[PDB]
């Protein structure tokens, strides 16, 4: 197997067709589904599977009380068959820790899991089912990483970490691994004030990541990373169509090199495909919560500080709950262009639905079409009254 290569570009995105949906919480009430969160999807040269941060307990067992808490020594990164539920009996632990990312370079997969206490965390980098590198904390304050698949070009897989304040400046680095080994790293540059939970996609030997400015931005920082030169850049989506959340209502004009003010010390992982006129943004429907989800065509959203939607597509009604969301693509599907894809973690339970003591989710993902398909809504589907 040769190392992959971001040879193609994104296809014309006109519609988002359904790709996967594991009714995990539905089935979970009468099956052995693990409690999870922070899911995402990735593909190897012959499969695409779901991934998530398990909580080391199923949904119906007594050990689910307290799963809101997102960091404990009982969490592992587990992977699983596309669209099936994460069941104890079918899941496959990948590494131990409560923050991750994973990409397949062509030859093998690289998985990274971060574990430890807030001030003393470490990231052990597995490459091919074996640990190979470790990196201890630098700012001793919740060393965290992507929470969604990473991208690799000819053997190099850029990946973004952050160690520090989640409500003030911090220290982020772009580590560049090859077969598990650190080829180099570098501190964040560009105009992005704060980076967190980067969603990266690849195409045309260049990686693009859209992240979360938890500190001051309602718009989102972007990082154009070059896999070969091993450099990178940052700024913000100029668009006044704000996509973070919480977020103030939509302005007429937007900020390009500085964060859009109004709401601070909060946000959600999100993503976007920036392809000139071929650009779509994803965002929650509520300006105050992670309820509903939508996709919108906003041409030149990255450069144009006035760009407004020209097409749309709902995914989750406002009344339904969303959560984290990100990108991923089958870099191995036969074709002349990479079909853009994404997933939205449908969050069920606490803090919103507090009739239960747990917090868990289910996934719904989609890929692009060149057809102008009709839209359908995709809710989690479970009835919280049944777990009482």
């Amino acid at each position, epitope marked *: 197997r040769e190392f992959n290569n971001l040879t193609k570009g994104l296809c014309t995105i006109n519609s988002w067709h359904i790709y996967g949906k594991d009714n995990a919480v539905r089935i979970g009430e009468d099956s052995d589904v693990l409690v999870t969160r922070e899911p995402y999807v990735s593909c190897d040269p012959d499969e695409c599977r779901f991934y998530a941060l398990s909580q080391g307990t199923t949904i119906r067992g007594k050990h689910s009380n307290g799963t809101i808490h997102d960091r404990s020594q009982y969490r592992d990164l587990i992977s699983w068959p596309l669209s099936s539920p994460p069941t104890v009996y079918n899941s496959r632990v990948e590494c131990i820790g409560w923050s991750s990312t994973s990409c397949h370079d062509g030859r093998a997969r690289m998985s990274i899991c971060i574990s430890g206490p807030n001030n003393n965390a470490s990231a052990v980098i597995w490459y091919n089912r074996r640990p190979v590198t470790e990196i201890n904390t630098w700012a001793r304050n919740i060393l965290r990483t992507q929470e969604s698949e990473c991208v690799c070009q000819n053997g190099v897989c850029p990946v973004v970490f952050t160690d520090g304040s989640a409500t003030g400046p911090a220290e982020t680095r772009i580590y560049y691994f090859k077969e598990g080994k650190i080829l180099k790293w570098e501190p964040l540059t560009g105009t992005a004030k704060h980076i967190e939970e980067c969603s990266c996609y690849g195409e045309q030997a260049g990686v693009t990541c859209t992240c979360r400015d938890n500190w001051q931005g309602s718009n989102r920082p972007v990082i154009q990373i070059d896999p070969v030169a091993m450099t990178h850049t940052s700024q913000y989506i100029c668009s006044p169509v704000l996509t973070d959340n919480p977020r103030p209502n939509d302005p007429t004009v937007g900020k390009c090199n500085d964060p859009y003010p*109004g709401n601070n010390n909060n946000g959600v992982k999100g993503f976007s495909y920036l392809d000139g006129g071929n650009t779509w943004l994803g965002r929650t429907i509520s300006i*105050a919560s992670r309820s509903g989800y939508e996709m919108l065509k906003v041409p030149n959203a990255l450069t144009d500080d006035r760009s407004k939607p020209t097409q749309g597509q709902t995914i989750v009604l406002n009344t*339904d*709950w969303s959560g984290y969301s990100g990108s991923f693509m089958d870099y191995w599907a036969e074709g002349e262009c990479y079909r853009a894809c994404f997933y939205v973690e449908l969050i069920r339970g606490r803090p919103k*639905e507090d009739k239960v003591w747990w917090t868990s989710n289910s996934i719904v993902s989609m890929c692009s079409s060149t057809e102008f398909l009709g839209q359908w809504n995709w809710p989690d589907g479970a009835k919280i009254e049944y777990f009482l």
Partner: antibody
Amino acid sequence: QVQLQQPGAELVKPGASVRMSCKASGYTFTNYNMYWVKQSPGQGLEWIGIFYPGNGDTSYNQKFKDKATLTADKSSNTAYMQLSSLTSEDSAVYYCARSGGSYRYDGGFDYWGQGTTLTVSS
Amino acid sequence: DIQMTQTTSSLSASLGDRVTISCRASQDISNYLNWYQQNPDGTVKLLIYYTSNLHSEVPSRFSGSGSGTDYSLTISNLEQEDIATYFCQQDFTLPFTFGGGTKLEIRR
């Protein structure tokens, strides 16, 4: 005819708890965020929080994320607000209001109740 | 929070008069500003929303304008029934905030 009907005045002993009934009639209850507002001398008008009957979503004015707990009865079409641990300063006038943007947070408060005046005394 | 500056809590005028109330916001609220009239009993009514949109059944005489940080309500022919307090408010972000208010009175 949107009609947010609200009682005239509440009399409660200092340190107690209380519930603000805000019976809504005139549109699809389940479709509009319901807000609450306090009007007191000095501070003036203040937003307490928001209850969305459609799915129970709530958000509070950080300065009231203790004093108030929003809720609502979908059957009787009433929104509620229970204030915990009443003091002299709690004496003001509380209004429940409907959103112009329905589920959105724009379009101002298109419709207001008449206001409940809360009193704390002995 | 976004502070709503309403400078002038008292405005004398005479019936027939074209009065103008002004409002100020700490930051650029991008037009997400409304105006409320509270008649002397307690009735808080909405007149203009999103800077210039009149609400349903609101006298065609009431005006609203302003951009950036400064906005303003313009009452054309002051009628006795306009002698109330007007409050501007922003809904650009959460939390929502209101200005101090401006009590209209008669010059005699």
